[PDB]
């Protein structure tokens, strides 16, 4: 948590006006009025990393929901677990009227 | 004594010089910051001369026919970069070379 908080601090202390000179703008003969088609490439990466670091708990929650809902159905969806005599015997024992 | 500490970076040395240049014209009043600033300047100039002499001795006594292998140099460059920008170097990256 300390490492993650430090990284988020560093990302948030960046400037907003964070254009990037791409060295391929040579072939795009910019005339001081046009807009470079790659000014926002480091800004987009900074935003992506920051937001992904801020949505960590949401990913954790969805992951644990997926894991729980796929584990609860192990004995019904996985063949070598569903076909052992012990799991079959237990599932039969539950249904004894 | 007072013993103003050694400047950590070059900006600190620049601000030391600025402070000295501001203080100069009131020596009978300050009389104590000037001496510490000048001792620091003496130490810095001494270190610079020693560094110049050691660099001269180093560059003229390197080796006759030694060379650096490219693989190791590339690994060292990448590791230096990673360590410089606070990322992590995997454990199998330096012990094995």
């Amino acid at each position: 948590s300390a490492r993650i908080s430090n990284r988020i601090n560093e990302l948030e202390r960046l400037p907003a006006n964070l254009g990037t000179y791409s060295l391929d703008d040579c072939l795009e003969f910019i005339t001081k009025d046009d807009l470079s088609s790659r000014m926002d490439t480091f800004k987009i990466k900074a935003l992506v990393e920051l937001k992904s670091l801020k949505l960590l708990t949401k990913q954790k929650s969805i992951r644990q929901k997926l894991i729980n809902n796929v584990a609860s159905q192990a004995h019904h969806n996985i063949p070598y677990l569903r076909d052992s005599p012990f799991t079959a015997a237990a599932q039969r024992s539950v249904q004894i009227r | 004594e007072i013993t103003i500490p050694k400047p950590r970076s070059s900006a600190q040395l620049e601000q030391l010089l600025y402070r000295y240049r501001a203080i100069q014209n009131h020596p009978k009043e300050n009389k104590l910051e000037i001496k510490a600033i000048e001792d620091t300047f003496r130490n810095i100039s001494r270190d610079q001369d020693i560094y110049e002499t050691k660099l001269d001795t180093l560059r003229k006594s390197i080796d006759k026919g030694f060379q650096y292998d490219e693989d190791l140099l590339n690994k060292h460059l990448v590791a230096l970069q990673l360590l410089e920008k606070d990322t992590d170097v995997p454990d199998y990256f330096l012990d094995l070379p």
Binding site: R3, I4, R7, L53, L55, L56 | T87, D88
Partner: peptide
């Protein structure tokens, strides 16, 4: 599938 946290988990352990 997004390696959001992998670097820090790896460097701490």
């Amino acid at each position: 599938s997004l390696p959001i946290e992998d670097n820090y988990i790896r460097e701490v352990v």
